[PDB]
Amino acid sequence: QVTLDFFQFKAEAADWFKQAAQEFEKENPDIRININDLRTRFVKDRVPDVITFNGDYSFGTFAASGVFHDFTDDPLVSELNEGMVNIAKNLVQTSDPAKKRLYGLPFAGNASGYIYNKDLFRKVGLDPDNPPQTWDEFIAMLKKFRDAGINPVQATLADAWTTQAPLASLAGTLVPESEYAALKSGDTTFKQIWTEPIEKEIELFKYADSEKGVTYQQGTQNFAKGTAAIIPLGTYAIPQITMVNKDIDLGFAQMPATNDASKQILTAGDDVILTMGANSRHKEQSMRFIRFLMSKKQLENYADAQSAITPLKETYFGNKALEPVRPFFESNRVADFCDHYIPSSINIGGYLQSAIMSGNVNQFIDSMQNEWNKVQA
Ligand SMILES: OC[C@H]1O[C@H](OC[C@H]2O[C@H](O[C@H]3[C@H](O)[C@@H](O)[C@H](O)O[C@@H]3CO)[C@H](O)[C@@H](O)[C@@H]2O)[C@H](O)[C@@H](O)[C@@H]1O
Ligand SMILES: [Cl-]
Ligand SMILES: [Cl-]
Ligand SMILES: [Mg+2]
Ligand SMILES: [Mg+2]
Ligand SMILES: [Mg+2]
Ligand SMILES: [Mg+2]
Ligand SMILES: [Mg+2]
Q1: Which residues contact 62 (CB under 8 A, 6 or more apart)?
Q2: Which atom of ligand 1 lies nearest, measured to the CA of 165?
Q3: What residues have CB less than 8 Å from 237, skipping those under 6 apart?
Q4: How many helices and strands (H and E) does the chain possess?
Q5: Among positive and negative, which fits the CA dihedral 276, 280, 283, 286?
Q6: Which of 38, 161, 346 has most ligand 1 atoms within 8 Å of CB, for mutation?
Q7: 1-111+270-322 and 112-269+323-377 agree in CATH topology
Q8: For ligand 1, what atom is nearest to the CA of residue 169?
Q9: Nearest CA-CA partner of 266 in 235, 241, 306, 230
Q10: Under CATH, which number does the domain 112-269+323-377 receive?
């Protein structure tokens, strides 16, 4: 007796949500679900009933502008990982602490680091269950693959956004989140906090010895076919790899940013936030679909399919490839993505892509500072 509009952001999970929506429809014939500029689509009169969104700055801006249903105090929230809930709350782009409310439910977590080929690790005598603990050991590992005739790093520089992954992996350890508050008030600068992360990202891609200029898809295809030791993307890329080669033996590791082995941090965020249009007129029916998606069976099936981390208090890891980072989650040694502090209007991806190709660190830093200053004032 209603048809819901479902906006589903994630290309890599398109099939999973299509099948879940169909399953719900068969069990609830009165509720049909139709799946598909963002400011245009989210206009109040036509806002989607059910929404998935990546948990980043854009989520936070739409949350602050009232596009999304306010889930604060919803009975469902008590079943969820408090850290992941607080991540969602802290994304709200507001200077008012009381406005840091919950505008979606964490549905799946990710981590940023690198995906590595365990068979190639074994090939050159490395322990596939215990990846490098320091920057020097990480670089030594890459040099080891190069010297053994193996392409150490599969870059994907044709798609600018992928260059943001190593930056966030490295910054997670090098740059406390508190620095971005200081950055906003002018009490620090990009030169002071991001010079070292960009320098190390440039050093990383020194070891992209083959096919560095390919697309996201080409890169994960190459890696699936065994042509590189690591691909420095987050957990979200794992299903893109395994779909090409289903029994590839993968690990996922934290990328250690310094030679301080006792102070390493894992960048991790809410990969998928599930929410409702605030001005939607079918909230009762939408919530039924959302409660279905947020059930343990669906969450863990999604996690298995997408190599993700469930949002329930008792965390489930969807792929044994994630075991090397389990310690970071258990100990709460995690950090926000640094680009969750960067306004969407700033084309950081383009700037980073350029900096990696030219090696011009100072132009990246000054461009970011220029763009930032104009936004903040
Ligand atoms: O470090 C990269 C990214 O990690 C998280 O986002 C995970 C997200 O990454 C991809 O989405 C990208 C889209 O494909 C692009 O079209 C868009 O321009 O850029 C985003 C990344 O910003 C995967 O496709 C997607 O499945 C996955 O969920 C962080 O939340 C994000 O801030 C980081 O940029
Ligand atoms: Cl918890
Ligand atoms: Cl588990
Ligand atoms: Mg985004
Ligand atoms: Mg911190
Ligand atoms: Mg095939
Ligand atoms: Mg195979
Ligand atoms: Mg130390």
Answers
A1: 38, 42, 53, 68
A2: 1
A3: 115, 216, 220, 231
A4: 16, 10
A5: negative
A6: 161
A7: yes
A8: 1
A9: 235
A10: 3.40.190.10
Cα separation, 359 vs 355, whole angstroms: 5
Compute the distance from residue 217 Cα to the ligand 6 centre, in Å: 14
Neighbours of ion ligand 4 (CB under 5 A): 54, 56, 58
Q: How was this structure determined?
A: X-ray
What is the number of the ligand closest to the CA of 176? Answer: 5
Which residues are CB-contacts of 198 (< 8 A; sequence separation ≥ 6)? 167, 352, 355, 361, 364, 365
Residues 6+ apart with CB under 8 A from 361: 195, 198, 199, 202, 355
Resolution (A): 1.8
The CATH code of the domain at 1-111+270-322 is 3.40.190.10
| Segments making up each domain of the chain, as ranges | 1-111+270-322, 112-269+323-377
According to DSSP, residue 120 is labeled: H
User: At 202, which amino acid appears?
Assistant: I
